[PDB]
Each structure stands twice: as C-alpha cells, then as structure tokens.
Amino acid sequence: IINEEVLNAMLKEVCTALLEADVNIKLVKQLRENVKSAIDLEEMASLNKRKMIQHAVFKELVKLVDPGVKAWTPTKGKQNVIMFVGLQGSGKTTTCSKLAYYYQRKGWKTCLICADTFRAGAFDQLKQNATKARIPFYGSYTEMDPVIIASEGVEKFKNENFEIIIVDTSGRHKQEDSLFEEMLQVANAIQPDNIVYVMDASIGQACEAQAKAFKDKVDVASVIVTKLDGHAKGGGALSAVAATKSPIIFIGTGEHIDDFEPFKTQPFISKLLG
Amino acid sequence: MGSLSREDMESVLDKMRDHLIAKNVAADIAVQLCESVANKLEGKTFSTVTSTVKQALQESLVQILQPQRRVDMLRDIMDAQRRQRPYVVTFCGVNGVGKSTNLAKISFWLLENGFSVLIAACDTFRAGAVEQLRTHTRRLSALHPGGRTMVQLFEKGYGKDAAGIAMEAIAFARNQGFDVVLVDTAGRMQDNAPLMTALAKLITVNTPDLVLFVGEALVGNEAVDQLVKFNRALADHSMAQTPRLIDGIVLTKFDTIDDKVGAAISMTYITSKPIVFVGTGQTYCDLRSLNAKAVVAALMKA
Ligand SMILES: Nc1nc2c(ncn2[C@@H]2O[C@H](COP(=O)(O)OP(=O)(O)NP(=O)(O)O)[C@@H](O)[C@H]2O)c(=O)[nH]1
Ligand SMILES: Nc1nc2c(ncn2[C@@H]2O[C@H](COP(=O)(O)OP(=O)(O)NP(=O)(O)O)[C@@H](O)[C@H]2O)c(=O)[nH]1
Ligand SMILES: [Mg+2]
Ligand SMILES: [Mg+2]
Known part of the structure; x- marks a missing residue:
C-alpha cells in the first residue's frame, strides 16, 4: 500500500512537471504507464524508492527524444x-x-x-x-x-x-x-x-x-x-x-x-x- | 459535500481538466478553473452531474474571455484628437509572435476608417526589422484615406535606443498632426532582464495610450509566463507612482491551432484584460475580434 501511494505520488509530480514543460498530454499519460510497467515495488529490497523511480522516468524520456x-x-x-x-x-x-x-x-x-x-x-x-x-x-x-x-x-x-x-x-x-x-x-x-x-x-x-x-x-x-x-x-x-x-x-x-x-x-x- | 457527491464531481472535473489541457489551456490555469467550479457547484442524476459541471465550466469560460468593458480604439482616438495629441499605441511581445505583421493589419484598419497613423520603427535591433515595416508603409499609402499624408514611417535605422526614437516619433507625430502612433518594438524573451528593462523604459518614458501584448495562440504554458513577466517589468521598472501595465491582447496565428484554442484562456485568465484583436492569417484583413461563444464552443467539442 505504502509503495503504491509513493509511486502515485512521484508520478503525479513528474506528470505535472512534464505537462508544464509543454509535453503533449498524450505523451505524458503514455510515459506514466510506461514507467509503471517498468517498475515493481515488490522486488525493491528495504534501497531507495525515489531514485529508482527518477531513473525510470528519466530513462523513458530518453527514449522519446531518440528517434533511433x-x-x-x-x-x-x-x-x-x-x-x-x-x-x-x-x-x-x-x-x-x-x-x-x-x-x-x-x-x-x-x-x-x-x-x-x-x-x-x-x-x-x-x-x-x-x-x-x-x-x-x-x-x-x-x-x-x-x-x-x-x-x-x-x-x-x-x-x-x-x-x-x-x-x-x-x-x-x-x-x-x-x-x-x-x-x-x-x-x-x-x-x-x-x-x-x-x-x-x-x-x-x-x-x-x-x-x-x-x-x-x-x-x-x-x-x-x-x-x-x-x-x-x-x-x-x-x-x-x-x-x-x-x-x-x-x-x-x-x-x-x-x-x-x-x-x-x-x-x-x-x-x-x- | 456530500463525499460521493464531491467524489463524482472531481472525477468528471478531472476529465474536463485533461480536456482543457489537451486543447492548449495552460495546465495550472486548467487546474484553477476546475477548483473554482468545485466551489461554485459544491453544496448543491449522474448525467445531471456531468451536465452540471459541463454547463458550469462553460459559463465561467465565457466570463473569463470578456472581462471589464470592450476596448473602443476609434472612439478613444477621438478623445486624443479633441486634446490635440496623438493616440499612442505600443506593441510588445516575445520573438516571432506577429508584432510587426499585426501592427500593419491594425493600421490598414485605422487608415480605412479615416485616421492618420505614424508607424514608429522602434525595433532597431533585428535584421530586416525596418525594411519590413517600410514595405508595409508603402503598401498602406495606397489606401489614401495626393494632398496631406495619412501614413508615414518614423525611423532612424538600426542601432539606436528605441525609447528615444519612440519619444521623437511621438513628438514628430504631434508636430505634424498624425492621429495615431503605432510603436513596433523588438522581440524579447520574458526572462531577459536587459531587454525587459529597456521595454519598460520605452513605456514609462513615453506613457502611451495603449500597451498591447502580442501573443500567439500556438504558445503553450509560456502564455502565462510571458504575460506575468511582461507585466512585472512594466510594474517593477515604472517611475510613476501609478504603474503602467498591459492594456489588452492581440492573439495571433489563431488559424494555425485548429480547435486547440486554449491559449485564449491562459492570457485572459492571468490579466483582467481583453483580447482586442485576433490574428487569423498573414494578410491585412486577417484581423478578427474575439467571439467568446465560438471559442468556448471549440473548447468543449474537441
Ligand atoms: N531569444 C531568441 N530569439 C530567437 C531565437 N531564434 C530566433 N529568434 C528571434 O525570433 C524571431 C525569429 O525570426 P525569424 O528567424 O524571422 O523566424 P522565421 O521562421 O524565419 N519567421 P517567418 O515565418 O516570417 O519566415 C526573430 O525575432 C529572431 O531574432 C533564439 O534562439 N532565441
Ligand atoms: N498564419 C499567421 N501568421 C501570422 C500571423 N501574424 C503574424 N504571422 C506571421 O508571423 C511571422 C512573424 O511575423 P512578425 O510580424 O515578423 O512577428 P514579430 O513579433 O514582429 N517578430 P520579431 O520579434 O522578430 O520582430 C510572419 O511569417 C508573419 O507572416 C497570423 O495571424 N497568422
Ligand atoms: Mg523568415
Ligand atoms: Mg517585429
């Protein structure tokens, strides 16, 4: 429970910042479920939740600017x-x-x-x-x-x-x-x-x-x-x-x-x- | 209240917030908008809940678009003439938004209505800035609205202090009996204090009759920051006890955003100041006044 609230808390914070950086709202909502898929609260041992989440956010943005x-x-x-x-x-x-x-x-x-x-x-x-x-x-x-x-x-x-x-x-x-x-x-x-x-x-x-x-x-x-x-x-x-x-x-x-x-x-x- | 009343309202209020954002309302304006709906609706049938917030949002959007009283330029110019002083108008805004183009549209409009206008070429920085104005003055002289002179460009090339040129242009205008001075200024980012200060000096030194912020309907969240910052320089750098602030808004490139119309609300929300003109294209007749219903209608259908 606590972990879910934490994740929804950082994610809401990320998403509000992203929208005010003028990202398309569809992109913002998509990244949100992309970071949720890529993160599992249950596997995390005792380590720090935020830092893994911040990395997860940042890693998904990097995919977005790279066209490959x-x-x-x-x-x-x-x-x-x-x-x-x-x-x-x-x-x-x-x-x-x-x-x-x-x-x-x-x-x-x-x-x-x-x-x-x-x-x-x-x-x-x-x-x-x-x-x-x-x-x-x-x-x-x-x-x-x-x-x-x-x-x-x-x-x-x-x-x-x-x-x-x-x-x-x-x-x-x-x-x-x-x-x-x-x-x-x-x-x-x-x-x-x-x-x-x-x-x-x-x-x-x-x-x-x-x-x-x-x-x-x-x-x-x-x-x-x-x-x-x-x-x-x-x-x-x-x-x-x-x-x-x-x-x-x-x-x-x-x-x-x-x-x-x-x-x-x-x-x-x-x-x-x- | 009740709790599941509030619960149903906020859930559909949220869908509306994400709707205004997608249509290019500035997110935090979209947010403040719904929180205001909440306070108005709360304390007083799921479809009615949906229809009550949709209806109530629509009512506030219309009120936001048309604050105070519609600005009446041709009428106010007459007051200037009665005092035998030019009616002076300053255009400001960030880089690229349509200041020089839309100043020309406006003078066309004034000229066709029988008013002489002196275009002050007070972007002395950006390349082309003055030839570009010059092309318009040569085309506007064709309106003839022969003996006497209805349009003239007041210009001193590049490099010179735009607050001083603008003072000369106005004095020249009064001296020759021109009805209107349209002061073009150079594009500047809103967080560039030098440029923001110099703009404030031009304004407070010359105290025009009308300061017009020019914003493009393509801007997103910066619609709020541009306007907040511009009004803060004007206030911070005033010498008058009465701070001189932005009087109204010219919203340009309305023909580029389809239905993503929400920048109109970002700018009418943060000022209690009207949208005097809408730019609907790149020519002289692409100058509309703003229809709130048509704007709010667009904002609901998406
Ligand atoms: N601060 C800042 N201003 C810029 C930057 N790039 C361009 N500008 C300014 O913003 C405007 C851009 O003008 P311009 O180069 O004419 O753009 P354009 O796309 O060619 N306009 P047009 O569609 O009329 O051809 C000018 O005022 C220019 O000085 C930038 O990176 N920073
Ligand atoms: N489609 C469309 N284009 C517009 C409109 N208003 C201005 N433009 C275009 O925007 C571009 C820049 O116009 P301009 O007057 O140079 O803007 P400015 O604020 O004076 N730019 P600067 O800060 O560089 O001096 C031009 O291509 C002009 O045709 C409008 O309402 N619709
Ligand atoms: Mg160009
Ligand atoms: Mg210009």
Missing part, C-alpha cells in the same frame, strides 16, 4: 543542399544564418538563399544577416516565384562549387494547402539532401499536428528547436521528433549568430524534468 535514426551530415566536396521549413515565426531565417556560420567556421564553403517571396523584408533580413557574417547570399527583391529563386540559387552556388547550400523559405502552416504545396514544389525543385523542420520551443499542444503535416508533405529529416535560451523547456520537441521521425540536431539559444550549439539529450531532459 542517425542524424544526417554533410559530405566534403559534394554539393549539399539544406532546406528550412517551419511555422510562421519559428526562427527559420535566423537559424539559416546560424547553421551556415556554424559550418563556415568549421571550414565549409557555405552560402545562403532567401526564397521567401512573401514576408516583407525577407530578403533584406537574410541579406543583412549574411553580410554581417561574411557568408554568400542569393535572392531577389523582384522575383515572386520561390521555386525559381531556389532553383536559380541552388544551381548558381553549385556552378561556384559550394559545399553547404542553405535555402530559407517562407513561414507556412498546415491548414494552408497552397503554401504546403508551394513547399513541396521548392523541395522537388532543389532536391535537398536534408530538410530541417524548425520549431519554436514555446509551442504548446498544437505541435504534433503541425509537425506531422510537415512530415506528411515533405521528407523532413532533421529538427532544430529554437528559442531555448535560458529558461525555455521545449517539451513540444518530443511531438516534433515522433511526428517528423527526425532527430533534433541543434538548439538556438539567443538572437545572435553564435547562439547556436549541437543538441545534447541529458541536459535538455534534466531541464525538462525539473
């Missing part, structure tokens, strides 16, 4: 095309320059393509970013067909033999079929080696539905969770990984170009957990 697919990597000498997709405001344009700068300081020939023909200032923004970081950019103040821009950009930087060709696209949401089709046309056009779904860490329960639809329309292969600076929890990332069948590769930790680091699981989960 190894993250994709660029290959030296070949033309690597990387495409950015994500919801409106998710951080795509800023992250494009962050990823380019990451690779450029690691010795890669990187460029940027602004193929956002909708957002006011979309080229200016990417242009200014790229210029401050000494990274080649390509776009147009006049062209309105983003498939043309992304095609002309990708080929141009290939004829100049770049290694990292990063295409920035417009923000779009799942219930806008014309945007989700335009996104399909850009991907088919440039044939990217790696599509990055970008998600704002402050996203709530809507994450699984959006992220799933991005993966249903286009072969999302990677995830970058932005705005994890400081205090953000980012529990939507679990829905994102499960929905897009992709690993989280980096995290964005601020507005500046160097606020960018490769994703590591345990510290992310520790912050998530407590």
Whole structure:
C-alpha cells in the first residue's frame, strides 16, 4: 500500500512537471504507464524508492527524444543542399544564418538563399544577416516565384562549387494547402539532401499536428528547436521528433549568430524534468 | 459535500481538466478553473452531474474571455484628437509572435476608417526589422484615406535606443498632426532582464495610450509566463507612482491551432484584460475580434 501511494505520488509530480514543460498530454499519460510497467515495488529490497523511480522516468524520456535514426551530415566536396521549413515565426531565417556560420567556421564553403517571396523584408533580413557574417547570399527583391529563386540559387552556388547550400523559405502552416504545396514544389525543385523542420520551443499542444503535416508533405529529416535560451523547456520537441521521425540536431539559444550549439539529450531532459 | 457527491464531481472535473489541457489551456490555469467550479457547484442524476459541471465550466469560460468593458480604439482616438495629441499605441511581445505583421493589419484598419497613423520603427535591433515595416508603409499609402499624408514611417535605422526614437516619433507625430502612433518594438524573451528593462523604459518614458501584448495562440504554458513577466517589468521598472501595465491582447496565428484554442484562456485568465484583436492569417484583413461563444464552443467539442 505504502509503495503504491509513493509511486502515485512521484508520478503525479513528474506528470505535472512534464505537462508544464509543454509535453503533449498524450505523451505524458503514455510515459506514466510506461514507467509503471517498468517498475515493481515488490522486488525493491528495504534501497531507495525515489531514485529508482527518477531513473525510470528519466530513462523513458530518453527514449522519446531518440528517434533511433542517425542524424544526417554533410559530405566534403559534394554539393549539399539544406532546406528550412517551419511555422510562421519559428526562427527559420535566423537559424539559416546560424547553421551556415556554424559550418563556415568549421571550414565549409557555405552560402545562403532567401526564397521567401512573401514576408516583407525577407530578403533584406537574410541579406543583412549574411553580410554581417561574411557568408554568400542569393535572392531577389523582384522575383515572386520561390521555386525559381531556389532553383536559380541552388544551381548558381553549385556552378561556384559550394559545399553547404542553405535555402530559407517562407513561414507556412498546415491548414494552408497552397503554401504546403508551394513547399513541396521548392523541395522537388532543389532536391535537398536534408530538410530541417524548425520549431519554436514555446509551442504548446498544437505541435504534433503541425509537425506531422510537415512530415506528411515533405521528407523532413532533421529538427532544430529554437528559442531555448535560458529558461525555455521545449517539451513540444518530443511531438516534433515522433511526428517528423527526425532527430533534433541543434538548439538556438539567443538572437545572435553564435547562439547556436549541437543538441545534447541529458541536459535538455534534466531541464525538462525539473 | 456530500463525499460521493464531491467524489463524482472531481472525477468528471478531472476529465474536463485533461480536456482543457489537451486543447492548449495552460495546465495550472486548467487546474484553477476546475477548483473554482468545485466551489461554485459544491453544496448543491449522474448525467445531471456531468451536465452540471459541463454547463458550469462553460459559463465561467465565457466570463473569463470578456472581462471589464470592450476596448473602443476609434472612439478613444477621438478623445486624443479633441486634446490635440496623438493616440499612442505600443506593441510588445516575445520573438516571432506577429508584432510587426499585426501592427500593419491594425493600421490598414485605422487608415480605412479615416485616421492618420505614424508607424514608429522602434525595433532597431533585428535584421530586416525596418525594411519590413517600410514595405508595409508603402503598401498602406495606397489606401489614401495626393494632398496631406495619412501614413508615414518614423525611423532612424538600426542601432539606436528605441525609447528615444519612440519619444521623437511621438513628438514628430504631434508636430505634424498624425492621429495615431503605432510603436513596433523588438522581440524579447520574458526572462531577459536587459531587454525587459529597456521595454519598460520605452513605456514609462513615453506613457502611451495603449500597451498591447502580442501573443500567439500556438504558445503553450509560456502564455502565462510571458504575460506575468511582461507585466512585472512594466510594474517593477515604472517611475510613476501609478504603474503602467498591459492594456489588452492581440492573439495571433489563431488559424494555425485548429480547435486547440486554449491559449485564449491562459492570457485572459492571468490579466483582467481583453483580447482586442485576433490574428487569423498573414494578410491585412486577417484581423478578427474575439467571439467568446465560438471559442468556448471549440473548447468543449474537441
Ligand atoms: N531569444 C531568441 N530569439 C530567437 C531565437 N531564434 C530566433 N529568434 C528571434 O525570433 C524571431 C525569429 O525570426 P525569424 O528567424 O524571422 O523566424 P522565421 O521562421 O524565419 N519567421 P517567418 O515565418 O516570417 O519566415 C526573430 O525575432 C529572431 O531574432 C533564439 O534562439 N532565441
Ligand atoms: N498564419 C499567421 N501568421 C501570422 C500571423 N501574424 C503574424 N504571422 C506571421 O508571423 C511571422 C512573424 O511575423 P512578425 O510580424 O515578423 O512577428 P514579430 O513579433 O514582429 N517578430 P520579431 O520579434 O522578430 O520582430 C510572419 O511569417 C508573419 O507572416 C497570423 O495571424 N497568422
Ligand atoms: Mg523568415
Ligand atoms: Mg517585429
């Protein structure tokens, strides 16, 4: 009896923390029965209950962030095309320059393509970013067909033999079929080696539905969770990984170009957990 | 009481809490909501119990969505004109939520109704921030609502202190007789004290007529933290004895969340402040006012 109450006590505490880290409530309820299956109060000899339970919780979170697919990597000498997709405001344009700068300081020939023909200032923004970081950019103040821009950009930087060709696209949401089709046309056009779904860490329960639809329309292969600076929890990332069948590769930790680091699981989960 | 009365209520209250959470109500708001239902229902037929909590929840949700009195911008602008001072409006919010886009929608709306507006470009930090505003001002000038001037962008490029630009823009506005100043500010996380302080300075130095928090309906539990923190800087960093606080809410990207509508409640719960505008898309006409019934209806069907 005492053991049951203890277990229901820690578990209620874990589950309330997880929901307020913006984990999908279905995920939280599933983990709860997953930790219950994996724990037997009766076998525990006199040892400490909490520590085994905390481990059991933490071990089940680790399964959730691991998609069991190894993250994709660029290959030296070949033309690597990387495409950015994500919801409106998710951080795509800023992250494009962050990823380019990451690779450029690691010795890669990187460029940027602004193929956002909708957002006011979309080229200016990417242009200014790229210029401050000494990274080649390509776009147009006049062209309105983003498939043309992304095609002309990708080929141009290939004829100049770049290694990292990063295409920035417009923000779009799942219930806008014309945007989700335009996104399909850009991907088919440039044939990217790696599509990055970008998600704002402050996203709530809507994450699984959006992220799933991005993966249903286009072969999302990677995830970058932005705005994890400081205090953000980012529990939507679990829905994102499960929905897009992709690993989280980096995290964005601020507005500046160097606020960018490769994703590591345990510290992310520790912050998530407590 | 009774004990199995309470027992039946809480069991169905729990199913409702897990329902509001799934629809993106902030968990602890969802919790406080039901505990309030409990106090109201307790002391006074299983289906009636189900229907009594479902009905009683619905009643409180409507009350939460529309607190105080609906905000009447065009009417209050008239009072500003009678005093011969611009009606000043500040937009604030975290990174990416739709401040610059929705400021433009609003000016379209004001312009079509015959009011001159000066857009203050007081995001002097983020790349593009000003070209982006500039594109909107050029498009809004087409409304013409020729001689005189209805829209102008007040701007000083990047790098400069946004509390000072905003003071100049307002003074310029009064000087040229613009009806409205729309102050765009830069995206900032709510736990970044420097940015939170500078925002508070812009506000307390300039004391606008209306401070509008911009939140996206895609946010989850941070809907509460953003708003609590923003109102705390505004209060903590005020120089007035009367602290200047957030006046209302613009809830954006309502077209992205299907029925997971609950962020409307997170934000109307923690302030006694109304949702002045709903963003329903990326264009000038995607600006709705909030219908409580339609929101609460969504929140029950799931
Ligand atoms: N604090 C913080 N801000 C970030 C981070 N990543 C991006 N931002 C900020 O949040 C906003 C993201 O803008 P942006 O890069 O335009 O995102 P987007 O997905 O391209 N938007 P759009 O859909 O309009 O194309 C900007 O204000 C940027 O400065 C981050 O990791 N931390
Ligand atoms: N679907 C949809 N997108 C919206 C809505 N409001 C804004 N957006 C989108 O959100 C993205 C960011 O808009 P923006 O005005 O730049 O937001 P901001 O608060 O000013 N961002 P920043 O903090 O970087 O300055 C753009 O893609 C814009 O089109 C809305 O109601 N619906
Ligand atoms: Mg962008
Ligand atoms: Mg802005």
